[PDB]
Each structure stands twice: as structure tokens, then as C-alpha cells.
Design a protein around this nucleic acid. Structure first.
Ligand SMILES: Nc1nc2c(ncn2[C@@H]2O[C@H](COP(=O)(O)OP(=O)(O)OP(=O)(O)O)[C@@H](O)[C@H]2O)c(=O)[nH]1
Lengths: 69, 94, 211, 82, 75, 72, 855
RNA sequence: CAUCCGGGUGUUGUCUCCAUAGAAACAGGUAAAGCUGUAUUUUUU
């Protein structure tokens, strides 16, 4: 019912901890009620980039730790 | 609620939940695969939205196996309820 | 069951009867119960006046209650040429702000300072209407359980608004030598277009009360 | 409504503890939660399932992947319950 | 703000190279072009190609990948 | 323009193959019918054990939740 | 240490929530909402606070039978004899309450009951300063009065989150007897008015900002609260927010589970009216009018609430109140609304900047608190202090700075950019508010407002306390400004004590008064004539009572009430002539708009000037104003830019400051002037200090001369005047206005859906002198006047000062031109400037006033 | 300071109306009363 209040994390670089001990990085662009993240694309954790902009699904997210304070 | 139920029934009759219904009506022996490696050869009794099943004359088939080993075991059960999330593929052997 | 019994000590009613009683009374005890009416006509106010040896044109007067001793004798404070007499500074004031306008207030009670009133009291058939206001600019928890206005409620509100006796639908009983009715007319500040004798009488009554 | 959710909400501001499905315990000031336990924390440590700890500023967490959330003993006394 | 649905729509409009990661499955990925859109994340994807991950290519036709097992999108 | 559900509908009375979650095994059979929840019903279902036809089950009904993808 | 604490705890009401828990919560910020309940006179904010208190506590001590029943209101936060007896709340006595929300997230709330009566805005100001959210309350009936608007404006300065409480539905239901539709319309109108008053935000029942109430009958609610209680049975959890949204506005509901289409068919009664107002009306009618059994049945059915056996036998009004209480439960809705309103902490930073300049905080290294008010809660003097950052433990030795010593400190810091802590304070005990007790606590914490007992000796009125541990910390630190006690004092009174054997006692009491009432400029004059500038009559009276009864206990003489007049000119100056024991200056009357702006970086300043009064670039360059009086000081000759003699200004303007403080005409301050330097004939032999000293007198003299030249005037202040009469008594009011000298009716505002002509006005404070009482008597207890000064609006005292003929009578009031002078002369006499019962005014120097201005 | 003129509250006893058992529940049946309840990403498909 309630929207996830990620207005503090808008336009900030976030370490998205996702399923299977995996990780994604990137600046936050948008979101919705399911927790489906819209972010500008970055590397997968030595390190290598894929894509320009990325849209991560809600269920996959274990965490999204803020790189920028 | 009643209307909704009716609609659901209609859908079942039409779409993918028709075959199962038919089987139930006929009451033939059918095999059911599962998540935990259990081939359930059984007679169908009940049916709902979630693909839960009340089963009669039930014959489960698995393999109790701590390797290296090859054993095939199977047991008879008189009456057995089943949950839908375990089920992957149900098949009717003619 | 509307009383304790034949002792006639406690009484306890329902609404319609009470309303009727109130209506009957109306001619006799129309004491105007907008609290603000009595600004500078409360008992407290009267007391203050008495202890200040000060009047209200309607209100009672007394023997001054302390030794009337002047002899302030014109200091740099309270000279003629220092203070400025723009305002007439009537007695009306001196009691309405006893601690300021009267200097040396011995035994003077703090009075009230209330809000304004806005009401409709009418003797007509229709109820719950905007009579003489100004106009504005521009499922259900109950539907059809009720229609909002009954038949009693026309007078219920009035009763609720009312003076002491009636606002309560129950009570205790009182010696009939009790229950002064003339009281409530002589308290009510009346003095405009009555003859002087009447006014005097009213004043006397007030004095009697007040003491 | 979910009384544990309510409790969690109440705790907001406290130094809560938080273990996931992965088995990684966090401990820190709770910032915000929702109907679904979509937690945030501040000044939070992060224990790896194997052992090693890692400090971090602002974590967000998703309730579905949260296992159990430890609240301090103060909230036992009052006042959500009755 | 730019919602996920909106993003998906944009991608569809574009018909650009998309690289999907599978849920609870690290070793396999998909790479194609978005054709469809649904109320859920479920979308139909023509010109798809399966990829074993560098811990190359493999043959794969036209596919609709179900919404529940998605992880990544990019376009 | 082509959404998934309509594609699925179109693909009725035609060949399809389905992949599964844990212990992944491909299928191959002619599609009988489908619904909004994506539960499937196939005829002549061959079992591709990672691209190896193990057995022919025939007339089968696939539950939606273990399914990975649909292919010709 | 412990025993005493226990004893203290014992002497107090036991609370429904646990106090320990509250204390614990108060450790953690974001769980402490500081709210100031603030409104017009008799909004019923105190009453509301009382309700909250009641809800909180198990049983309250002085809560008698009658109050319980619901006849007399109980104001638990009246406290003091003054207030109990007066009918007005008269100081800031709030309280601290752990409250749950709709969805019970417990949160501790520092509530503060501001007084409504205008003459105590001091207290309101203090509340605002303290509080980060401000519960505005409004009387439905009197509507959004000017006062409310003013408050809103002044709260958007502060700045603060504005939760509104529309109190007195009961009065539109019962007194005005509005049809429900009519009531709804009225409410809408009120909301619109509120919005208009506001600049940025929008207010409505949706989005939890309005809170509808009636404290007499004892129920507050928000739409959301209502929905929670009595629209969760009927609807699923998904479509509840939507429903709520639908509820407000031009929206209708024709039969359909669960639609609800905006507009429309056959019958009227909108969604709001339908699902709320109508219900309320029904409740009222059944509560009063219906047979009891049926009502009970209804309440069992529709609301799921049970009338007890005793409650059935209550008298209507009390009974009604009880019913309402049963319906709308212990007021969590209000709390929820408050929570929704407060952002939070987006605003907080801004607010703190406003109070104490922008910059950045320092948490662990140093604690800082705003000593806000000194008060007398439990007899002894406490200090209500908001700890802004850090945590202040019992017995800690603490720095202090009265907000007089604030600007200076800042300046010093700037200049800087051996250790020297000027005063100190041992914190003897600390506790919470309030109502009728201090709950004593060891730790003060960042966020919470608390009464501290050691804090007093050093400070008066307002202060900053802190505890630094370094030079860096000190540097970081900022100091709060003095509170803009919105109304600003005007109304004068001169004390003597009757038996001057006890002048000392009076002095002692006077200090206390100054501390305790913080809107009290108490000037001690040269001639033993101790002076008190109150906000106004009532406030002054209250203060007098406090002094003459409690804080002194002496027979204390009291002058007829005066006002401070101030010195300004009509024409411009005509001859800058210097003085010697050598500078000459001359002044122009400033533009009205500019003055107004003043009342409410050089390039920037210039730009501002240009925007305001159409001033040129040179003019912009020259200026350097002072005091917040206001006067403007311009360096506008020819030679000054080449000259470095006119350079080094910081010293030069001291004289100007002095002049502004104490004028020529009355030693009564200067106002509304643009001063212009025309010549500064400094000699060759400097001796710098001496020169500076000379300038300090000389500048003042020059200013005086300029004023004299400029056809100077005393300015009276004016009271802006609310009058809420019954419509047909407006003629009476008009007549009354006519009767006195100065007065004016700007606009007769018809209040929506009442008989009340809110007839705003202007009245000179001097000719007020109990005006309120006069108004009330004449208008037979109708139209509560209110007089005030928020605007800081001054005006000409009619006619020409410096005319020896003037007037006829001594004891009587003087005519208007004549009065121009009379006041001035009397003021002079009061000061101790003139010599005699007959005297005059004239300004040296020199040359016989330039040969009487060349004849 | 006191004097009347009135008043509650309980402690009791006495006079006129309304009552009316000498004990029931276990195990669950019958009948009523009092509250609690439709799988596609965050809980149970
Ligand atoms: N009709 C009506 N009267 C009310 C209502 N609320 C309060 N009052 C009455 O009006 C007066 C105002 O209540 P208070 O709480 O004393 O007002 P206040 O907010 O303290 O005003 P200040 O004294 O200026 O602080 C009281 O005598 C109450 O009985 C209301 O909702 N309706």
C-alpha cells in the first residue's frame, strides 16, 4: 500500500546487494511499490560494467546499501 | 463470491485446469512429479484453485540414497492430502 | 418513577415534559444567559466595586469599606503636569481591571474576561435553518437509519442552552421559599427606558443580594 | 494490523539488531520501516555469515529477506500492547 | 522520477539490446530484444540468446521469459 | 504491440518447450491451453533432460511456479 | 539523591502510560515532537490540552465531580490563581505526553499551551520558539480572524509546521444551528481562508493537517481517525486511502459498493457531509433529543460502543459529551495528524538557523540549549529550556548567555575569525512539564524541552546555555537571538511603591516580573519613576496582580496608563549646522513602504534599497542603518570617498545609535527617518580616542538639529483593533469610535455563517485606556474587542509640536493640534528635562538658532 | 464568634409493596446471547 520512501536515496550511488551473494552498483533514478529499482547502470562485483541504464526487480533485492552518505 | 466461483469453474473447464477436472470425473490412476523427487502415482479425489489434491490408493516413488548408492523405494498409502507448491508436473497415463 | 417517591426529595425526568416546562417558564424567568451580559454585573465584580468604593450606573453602592484617606500630596509621580488626561477614566474601568486602574486594591477579587455568543432562539414552526446570519462564499456510516431532525430536537437544543434548572433533566428538591424568581430579573442589568423608581428598586435588590 | 510491524515501527530510533535469510546480522539505529518490514538503519555494523564484520552508514533492507529483528528490552514495558 | 513500468515501455519502444539475469541461477544469462509488456515484469523477448557466464554463445530461439524469474534488465 | 498473454493465446495448438526450477529439465509438447496465471497443458510431452529425450509422458499439465521460460 | 526523587514522584498523578518508557523514548530524537498549541483568544487550546492530559492520566487530583461530568471545563494547565480566577490562560504552562498514533507508534510530545489573548503574545512567541510544530486552533464560529492569520504569518517566519484544529463544531451544530450542508460549507470557507493566509503549503482534512474538534463536548478527530474507527469493517484494506481522499471536497456518493462517483444524482449531501458531518449531527440529535434506549441500541450496532448503567442517567450536555467520548476514542487522531504535519527535520535545521544564524551543528563535543522562558511552575523559579543538541545531566555546570549578550558575542567571534567564560550555572535539578507538576529527571536530551532549576541567576528573559570542551567547539557555536515577541510592548505604566521604605522589595519583584513575564520592557527611570511597558491593559493588570499579591506583597501605586511616543518628521531638513564644545547632519522622512519593510553585503543591500524605495546607486552605497527602530544613516556628502577621515565608520555611528535610542523632543526614541551626513569638519591634530568621543556627542547633536529642521513630530502608536460584534450593534460600535479622538474603521468583515461582524480597526493606544470594557458594556456583552500591536504601526500625534500657545485646560483632554505639543511637554516633564509647571522646548546650537532662522 | 430556617451521607431499626433458592457446571448435543474470520515480487502456494 505504502510507497518505499527512497527520496533520501534519489540520485545517489547505491550498492544493491542482490540474490545469490551477488552485487550491483549505480546511481538511483526511480522506484515503485514493489521495490523495483530504476538506476543508471554500473559494475557487477575484479570488476566490470554492463549496460547503460538498469531496472532491477524487487524480489531479487537482499539490500541496497548507500555508497554516498 | 458465488459468481466469482462460477467464473473460476468455467475457466477451469476451458483452460489448463480442464484435464485434471476430467481425470477427477473419470477417476483414473495418474502420476504427479514433485519438488523433492517424489513420483506420486495416485487416484484423484479433490481439486481447487491452488492445485491441492486429496489422493486415494497412493503410491509415492523416490530414492533414499547417500552416495555412492542406487536404491529405488516406494510405499502404499490409503488416503493422502497434498499441497500445490510441491507439484511441478501432473500427468495422466491412459 | 419520575421521583424518589412521596418524600419528594429527588426528581428525574425525560425531555419533552422538561421542554414544555421550560416553555411555560419563558415569560417569567427570561434571564438572558449569554454569560457576557453580566460583564461588570457578576457577584465578584460587585465585590470588587464595593472594595474600591466604585459604582456602575446600574449597580449597587456601599459604605466605602476602608478609611477614605487621600493625602497623596502631589509628588513627581502623580502630578498634574506629568500625567496626561486624554481618557476620562471612569469607575466602570476601575472594577473591570481592579489591579491596574485602582491603585491600592485591598481585598479585591480577580474578575472574568469571556468570549462572544452566537445563537438563534425563535418562536416558529421550522427548525435548524440559517435565520439571520450572513451567507458563505460559494457507504455512509448511517444512511436511512435516521432522518436527522426529530420532533423533540427542536426544543432539546434550546433546553441544553438554558439556565440552571432546566439544563439538568434531573435533580434535588428545594423549600419553595427557596427558588427565588425575582432574583433573576433584578440581577439582569435592565436600566434603559424604565422609570427611576424601578431602577432604584433594582439597585436596592442588587445591594441586598450582593451583601 | 500486524502487531509485530507496529512494534518494529515503535522501535524506530532504537539500536535494533537484524538477521537476514543469508545469516548476516546487522546492529544499529533503525531509521524507517513500512507495512512490509522494509527496514532502514544508520551507523550500522554488518556481520558476515562466516564471521568478519564490516561497518557501514545507511543500509536499506527488504522484509521478505529479513529473518528476525531484535528490539531492546525497554519496549517490553510499554505501550503498543495494552 | 522514472518508474519501472515507464522504463520497460521505453525499452519496448526502442527495441534495443537487452541482457537478462535469471533469479536463483548465476551461471546462465539471456540476451535479446524486448517485444512485450505486462502488468507484471513478465515480457516477451524475440531474438534471444542464452549465455554461460565467465566464472562465447549458445543457440536459442524466440522466447517469453516469465516475470517471477527475472533479475536484471538494461536498454 | 505483441504482449505476452496474446502471444501465449496465439501459440495454442502448436509446439512448445518448458524449462524448470531446481533439478532443471526441459519439456517438448503440443500446447492444448493456457490461462492468466500461466499454468500449462501439453500433449505429446517429451522430457529433454538437458537436451536429451529421456521419456515421452504424453498428456500432461504443468504448474506455473516452477516454470522458467517458453520456447518453440 | 534517590529518596528525594522517589518522594517527588509520589507527589504527582500516576499516568496510564509508563513514565520510565517516556523517559527512555526522550533519549532518542525523532520520537519527541515539540508542539505549541496556539490560537486566538478562547479558541479552547487550554481545554484541548486538558483533554490530552485526562487521556494520559489514570486519575487527576483536583479533577472534581462537576468537571468529570463535563459542566465546568477543567483547564489542567491553568495552574495559577490569576488564571484560574481570570478565565484566561496567562502564561506558558504546557505538559509532556507519550501518545500513540492511528497505528500505535508511540511518540513523546512536548505540548505547550500558549495563551490566546493577544496581550500575551509574548507567551505565544515563546511557544513558537520552543515548538517545531504549532497546533493552531480556531473557533469555527469567529472564523479565521485576523489574529489567526497573523499567527500563521508569524509562524511561517519562525518557522514551524502548521497543524490546524478547527474547534467548536458544537457551536455550529448547536448554537448557530446550521444545517449540515451549511456547516460543511462554512468549514470549507474556513479552510480556504486558512490556505489564503498561508503562502506555500495547502491545508485540508485529507493529508492529516486539519483536526476537527469541540473541546467543550470533548472530542477531536481527523478524517483518517474516523475512518479507522468506523470505516474498516465495511471496506477492504486496499481501498481505504482512496476512500479517505474521496471524502473531502466537491464529491458525492450515490448507491454503490464501493463507488462513489464525484458528481452526481438526485439527492445532495456530499461525501464529507454523508460519511462525517451528518453522522456527527445525528449523534448530537440522538444524544440530546432521542429516547435513550434507541440511542443505546444504535451505539451498540453502528459504533460498537456500550453505554454503562450510570451513564444513561446523565443530564443532556454531560451525557452528550460522554457519548462523544465513547464514539471518538481517546484522542490519537490528533496525534497522528500532528505526526503527518511534522516533516520532520527538513524544517528543523531552517528553524534553528532562523533562531541562531545558519552554519553547522556539533553533537558530542558540546551540548547547547535555548533557555526560552523563566517561569514559576512549582512556586520557585524554573527555566523552560529546549536542549537543541547534546545531553544535559543533573548537577552539570553550564555556560549561559542572555540574548542581549548574543549579537555582541557573535561580533566578537567574527572578529576573532586565554579562555573566557563570562557567567556560569550549577544545574540543581531538571524535569518535565507539566500542568500541575514537574516530573523530575536526571538527563536532559537533544530535542526535549525541560524545566531546569539552577538556570536564572545569570540570565533574564531568553538565553543560550551550552557546555563546550575546546576552542574549535566554541568557534563552531552559535547564539540564539532574542525572541521576536511578536506584538512588541507599547502600553506604559509608572510604578511607585506606596511606602518607599519598601522600594527594594518592589525592585526585587520587578526583576521577577521582567524574568517571568518576558514581554515587559521595564525601564527604571532617572527620577525614581519605575516604568513598565506591557503589551496592554489586561497583561499589565495580570503582571500587577502577580507582583502586588505574590512576588512583592506591597501596596503599590500605579499611574494612569501612558504610551511611549516616538520622534519623527514630516518635511525634510533645511539646514545642516554643526556643533562644537565638529559634525553637521540632517534627516529626511523615510518612505512608508520602506519603513514597513524595515519593521518586518553592500551590493545586495543596494539592490534591496532599489527594489523598495527607488533609491539611486549613490544612495545605496552611502547607507548604514541601525537599531531596528527604524532609522537609516547615510554618508552622503561629496568629499567622503576621497577622504579616509569619513572611512572608519564603526566608531562614528555610536553617537547615531545613542541619538536613535533617546531623541531630542522627549528623550523618547527616534523612528521613521533617513538620516544624511552633510559635513564632518575634523581638524588636523587627531588624538583618535578624543576625536571619537567628541563625535559620539556631536553626532547626536547633529541628529537632533536635523530632526528639529525637519518639522519633527511625536508619533503615537496605534492599536489594531478586533471587534466581533453581533451585526446590528455595529452602529453602536461606530458611535463609540466616533466619541473618542483618534480611531478608524478600516473594514467591516462579515464572518461566514454567524451574526458576528468582525469589524477590524485602528485606535491610538493612548486613547484606548480600558476601551475593551467600554465596548463590552455599550454592546451589552457582545463583541469581545481585542487590541494589539503586531504590526508596529506608528502615526502622527495630530498637529504641530513646538507651539507655546497650544491649549486651554489642564485637567481635561486637549484639542488635536494642541495635543500635538501637550504630550511632548508632559513627556519632557516626566523625563526630567524641563524646569517648571510652565515651560517650553527649543534646540541648541548655535548663534541664537541662526538668528531665529534669519527672522 | 453564635442563633435559628433547610440539606445530605452512612450506621441502624421499624412500618407499606416487589420478591422467592437451598445450590449449579463435567462429555459434548439442542436453543439463544457475546466477541473473532479465495495462488502471478514483501510473509500461507
Ligand atoms: N461552545 C463551545 N465552547 C467552548 C469550546 N471549547 C471551549 N469552550 C468554552 O470557551 C472557553 C474557552 O476555553 P479555554 O480552554 O479556557 O480557552 P483557551 O484556549 O484557554 O483561551 P486562552 O485563555 O486565551 O488560552 C471555556 O469557558 C470553555 O468552556 C467549544 O468547542 N464550544
Amino acid at each position: 500500500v505504502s510507497t518505499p520512501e527512497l527520496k533520501k536515496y534519489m540520485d545517489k550511488k547505491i550498492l544493491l546487494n542482490i540474490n545469490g551473494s551477488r552485487k550491483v552498483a549505480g546511481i538511483l533514478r526511480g522506484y515503485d511499490i514493489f521495490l523495483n529499482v530504476v538506476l543508471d547502470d554500473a559494475m557487477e562485483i575484479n570488476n566490470h560494467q554492463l549496460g547503460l541504464q538498469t531496472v532491477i526487480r524487487g524480489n531479487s533485492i537482499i539490500s541496497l546499501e548507500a555508497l554516498d552518505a | 463470491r458465488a459468481e466469482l466461483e462460477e467464473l473460476e469453474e468455467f475457466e477451469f473447464k476451458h483452460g489448463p485446469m480442464s484435464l485434471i477436472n476430467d481425470a477427477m470425473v473419470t477417476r483414473t490412476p495418474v502420476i504427479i512429479s514433485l519438488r523433492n523427487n517424489h513420483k506420486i502415482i495416485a487416484r484423484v479425489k479433490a481439486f481447487d484453485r491452488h492445485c491441492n489434491m486429496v489422493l486415494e490408493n497412493v503410491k509415492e516413488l523416490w530414492t533414499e540414497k547417500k552416495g555412492k548408492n542406487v536404491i529405488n523405494r516406494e510405499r502404499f498409502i490409503s488416503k493422502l492430502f497434498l499441497r500445490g507448491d510441491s507439484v511441478i508436473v501432473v500427468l495422466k497415463t491412459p | 418513577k419520575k421521583v424518589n417517591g412521596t418524600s419528594y426529595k429527588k426528581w428525574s425526568f425525560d425531555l419533552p415534559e422538561m421542554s414544555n416546562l421550560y416553555r411555560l417558564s419563558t415569560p417569567l424567568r427570561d434571564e438572558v444567559t449569554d454569560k457576557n451580559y453580566y460583564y461588570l454585573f457578576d457577584k465578584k465584580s460587585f465585590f470588587n466595586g464595593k472594595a474600591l468604593n466604585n459604582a456602575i450606573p446600574g449597580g449597587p453602592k456601599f459604605e466605602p469599606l476602608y478609611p477614605r484617606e487621600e493625602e497623596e500630596d502631589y509628588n513627581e509621580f502623580n502630578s498634574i503636569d506629568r500625567v496626561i488626561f486624554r481618557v476620562p477614566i471612569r469607575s466602570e474601568y476601575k472594577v473591570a481591571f481592579p489591579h491596574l486602574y485602582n491603585s491600592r486594591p485591598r481585598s479585591v477579587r480577580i474578575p472574568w474576561y469571556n468570549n462572544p455568543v452566537s445563537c438563534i432562539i425563535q418562536n416558529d414552526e421550522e427548525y435548524d435553518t440559517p435565520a439571520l446570519f450572513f451567507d458563505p462564499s460559494l457507504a455512509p456510516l448511517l444512511a436511512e437509519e435516521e432522518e436527522l431532525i426529530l420532533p423533540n430536537t427542536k426544543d432539546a437544543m434550546s433546553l441544553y442552552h438554558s439556565p440552571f434548572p432546566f439544563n439538568r433533566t434531573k435533580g434535588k428538591m428545594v423549600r419553595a421559599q427557596d427558588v427565588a424568581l425575582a432574583k433573576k430579573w433584578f440581577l439582569q442589568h435592565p436600566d434603559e427606558e424604565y422609570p427611576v423608581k424601578v431602577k432604584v428598586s433594582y439597585q436596592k435588590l442588587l445591594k441586598n443580594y450582593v451583601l | 494490523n500486524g502487531i509485530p510491524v507496529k512494534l518494529l515501527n515503535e522501535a524506530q530510533g532504537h539500536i535494533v539488531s537484524l538477521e537476514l535469510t543469508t545469516g548476516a546480522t546487522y546492529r544499529g539505529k533503525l531509521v524507517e520501516s513500512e507495512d512490509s518490514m522494509n527496514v532502514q538503519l544508520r551507523d550500522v555494523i554488518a556481520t558476515e555469515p562466516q564471521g568478519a564484520v564490516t561497518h557501514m552508514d545507511q543500509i536499506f533492507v527488504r522484509g521478505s529477506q529479513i529473518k528476525f529483528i531484535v528490539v531492546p528490552d525497554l519496549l517490553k514495558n510499554a505501550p503498543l500492547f495494552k | 522520477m522514472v518508474p519501472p513500468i515507464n522504463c520497460i515501455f521505453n525499452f519496448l519502444q526502442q527495441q534495443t539490446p537487452v541482457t537478462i539475469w535469471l533469479f536463483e541461477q548465476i551461471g546462465i544469462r539471456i540476451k535479446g530484444k524486448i517485444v512485450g509488456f505486462d502488468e507484471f515484469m513478465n515480457v516477451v523477448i524475440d531474438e534471444a540468446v542464452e549465455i554461460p557466464v565467465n566464472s562465447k554463445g549458445t543457440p536459442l530461439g524466440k522466447i517469453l521469459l516469465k516475470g517471477d524469474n527475472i533479475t536484471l534488465i538494461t536498454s | 504491440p505483441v504482449n505476452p498473454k496474446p502471444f501465449l493465446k496465439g501459440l495454442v495448438n502448436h509446439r512448445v518447450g518448458v524449462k524448470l526450477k531446481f533439478n532443471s529439465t526441459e519439456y517438448r509438447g503440443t500446447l492444448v491451453s493456457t490461462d492468466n496465471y500461466f499454468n500449462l497443458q501439453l500433449n505429446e510431452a517429451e522430457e529433454f533432460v538437458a537436451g536429451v529425450s529421456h521419456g515421452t509422458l504424453g498428456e500432461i499439465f504443468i504448474r506455473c511456479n516452477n516454470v522458467l521460460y517458453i520456447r518453440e | 539523591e534517590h529518596t528525594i526523587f522517589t518522594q517527588l514522584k509520589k507527589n504527582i498523578p500516576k499516568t496510564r502510560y509508563n513514565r520510565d518508557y517516556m523517559l527512555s523514548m526522550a533519549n532518542i530524537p525523532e520520537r519527541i515532537i515539540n508542539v505549541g498549541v496556539i490560537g486566538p483568544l478562547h479558541s479552547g487550546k487550554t481545554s484541548l490540552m486538558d483533554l490530552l492530559v485526562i487521556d494520559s492520566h489514570k486519575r487527576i487530583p483536583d479533577m472534581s465531580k462537576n468537571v468529570e461530568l463535563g459542566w465546568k471545563p477543567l483547564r489542567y494547565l491553568d495552574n495559577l490563581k490569576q488564571e484560574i480566577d481570570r478565565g484566561l490562560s496567562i502564561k506558558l504552562n504546557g505538559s509532556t505526553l507519550l501518545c500513540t498514533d492511528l497505528e500505535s507508534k508511540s511518540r513523546m510530545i512536548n505540548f505547550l499551551d500558549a495563551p490566546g489573548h493577544v496581550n500575551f503574545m509574548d507567551e505565544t512567541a515563546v511557544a513558537l520558539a520552543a515548538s517545531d510544530l504549532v497546533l493552531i486552533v480556531i473557533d469555527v464560529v469567529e472564523g479565521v480572524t485576523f489574529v489567526v492569520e497573523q499567527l500563521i504569518k508569524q509562524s511561517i517566519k519562525n518557522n514551524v509546521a502548521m497543524c490546524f484544529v478547527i474547534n467548536k463544531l458544537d457551536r455550529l451544530i448547536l448554537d448557530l444551528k446550521l444545517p449540515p450542508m451549511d456547516a460543511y460549507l462554512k468549514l470549507n470557507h474556513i479552510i480556504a481562508n486558512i490556505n489564503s493566509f498561508t503562502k506555500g503549503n495547502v491545508f485540508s482534512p485529507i493529508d492529516n493537517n486539519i483536526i476537527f474538534a469541540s473541546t467543550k463536548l470533548g472530542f477531536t478527530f481527523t478524517i483518517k481517525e474516523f475512518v479507522s474507527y468506523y470505516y474498516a469493517h465495511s471496506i477492504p484494506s486496499s481501498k481505504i486511502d482512496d476512500f479517505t481522499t474521496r471524502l473531502w471536497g466537491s464529491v458525492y456518493y450515490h448507491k454503490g459498493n464501493f463507488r462513489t462517483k464525484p458528481f452526481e444524482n438526485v439527492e445532495k449531501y456530499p461525501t464529507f457531509v454523508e460519511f462525517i458531518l451528518i453522522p456527527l449531527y445525528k449523534i448530537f440529535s440522538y444524544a440530546l433529543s432521542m429516547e435513550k434506549d434507541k440511542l443505546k441500541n444504535l451505539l451498540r450496532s453502528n459504533f460498537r460502543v456500550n453505554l454503562s448503567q450510570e451513564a444513561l442517567q446523565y443530564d443532556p450536555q454531560p451525557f452528550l459529551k460522554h457519548v462523544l467520548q465513547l464514539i471518538f476514542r481517546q484522542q490519537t487522531g490528533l496525534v497522528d495528524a500532528i505526526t503527518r504535519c511534522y516533516q520532520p527535520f527538513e524544517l528543523f535545521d531552517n528553524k534553528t538557523a532562523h533562531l541562531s544564524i545558519p552554519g553547522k551543528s556539533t553533537p558530542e563535543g558540546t551540548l547547547w540549549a535555548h533557555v526560552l522562558k523563566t517561569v514559576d511552575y512549582g512556586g520557585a523559579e524554573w527555566s523552560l529550556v529546549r536542549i537543541y543538541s547534546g545531553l544535559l545531566k543533573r548537577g552539570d555546570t553550564v555556560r549561559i548567555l542572555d540574548t542581549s549578550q548574543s549579537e555582541s558575542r557573535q561580533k566578537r567571534q567574527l572578529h576573532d575569525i586565554s579562555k573566557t567564560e563570562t557567567p556560569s550555572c550549577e544545574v540543581e535539578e531538571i524535569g518535565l512539564l507539566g500542568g500541575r507538576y514537574v516530573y523530575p529527571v536526571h538527563e536532559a536530551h537533544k530535542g526535549q524541552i525541560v524545566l531546569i532549576k539552577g538556570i536564572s541567576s545569570a540570565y533574564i528573559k531568553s538565553a543560550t546555555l551550552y557546555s563546550v570542551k575546546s576552542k574549535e567547539d566554541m568557534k563552531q557555536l552559535k547564539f540564539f537571538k532574542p525572541l521576536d515577541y511578536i506584538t512588541e510592548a507599547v502600553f506604559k505604566i509608572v510604578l511607585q511603591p506606596l511606602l518607599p521604605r519598601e522600594l527594594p522589595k518592589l525592585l526585587d519583584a520587578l526583576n521577577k516580573i521582567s524574568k517571568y513575564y518576558p514581554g515587559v520592557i521595564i525601564k527604571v527611570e532617572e527620577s525614581g519613576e519605575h516604568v513598565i511597558l506591557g503589551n496592554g491593559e489586561l497583561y499589565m493588570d495580570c503582571l500587577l496582580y502577580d507582583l502586588r499579591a505574590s512576588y512583592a506583597k506591597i501596596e503599590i501605586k500605579i499611574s494612569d496608563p501612558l504610551t511611549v511616543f516616538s520622534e519623527s518628521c514630516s518635511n525634510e531638513s533645511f539646514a545642516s549646522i554643526p556643533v562644537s564644545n565638529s559634525i553637521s547632519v540632517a534627516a529626511e522622512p523615510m518612505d512608508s513602504k520602506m519603513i514597513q519593510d524595515l519593521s518586518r553585503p553592500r551590493k545586495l543591500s543596494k539592490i534591496l534599497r532599489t527594489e523598495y524605495g527607488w533609491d539611486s546607486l549613490a544612495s545605496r552605497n552611502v547607507w548604514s542603518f541601525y537599531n531596528g527602530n527604524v532609522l537609516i544613516n547615510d554618508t552622503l556628502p561629496d568629499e567622503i570617498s576621497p577622504e579616509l577621515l569619513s572611512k572608519y565608520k564603526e566608531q562614528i555611528i555610536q553617537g547615531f545609535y545613542w541619538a536613535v535610542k533617546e531623541g531630542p523632543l522627549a528623550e523618547e526614541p527616534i523612528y521613521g527617518v533617513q538620516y544624511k551626513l552633510l559635513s564632518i569638519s575634523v581638524p588636523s591634530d587627531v588624538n583618535i580616542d578624543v576625536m571619537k568621543s567628541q563625535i559620539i556627542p556631536l553626532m547626536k547633536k547633529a541628529c537632533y538639529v536635523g530632526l528639529l529642521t525637519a518639522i519633527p513630530i511625536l508619533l503615537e502608536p496605534i492599536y489594531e483593533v478586533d471587534i466581533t460584534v453581533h451585526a446590528p450593534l455595529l452602529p453602536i460600535v461606530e458611535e463609540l469610535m466616533k466619541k473618542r479622538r483618534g480611531s478608524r474603521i478600516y473594514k467591516t468583515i462579515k464572518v461566514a455563517g454567524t451574526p458576528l461582524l468582525e469589524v477590524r480597526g485602528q485606535v491610538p493606544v493612548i486613547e484606548s485606556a480600558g476601551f475593551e470594557t467600554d465596548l463590552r458594556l455599550s454592546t451589552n456583552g457582545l463583541g469581545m474587542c481585542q487590541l494589539y500591536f503586531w504590526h508596529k504601526i506608528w502615526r502622527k500625534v495630530p498637529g504641530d509640536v513646538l507651539d507655546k500657545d497650544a491649549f486651554i485646560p489642564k485637567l481635561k483632554p486637549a484639542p488635536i493640534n494642541s495635543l500635538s505639543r501637550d504630550f511632548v511637554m508632559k513627556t519632557r516633564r516626566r523625563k526630567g528635562i524641563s524646569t517648571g509647571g510652565f515651560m517650553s522646548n527649543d534646540g541648541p546650537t548655535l548663534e541664537k538658532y541662526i538668528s531665529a532662522e534669519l527672522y
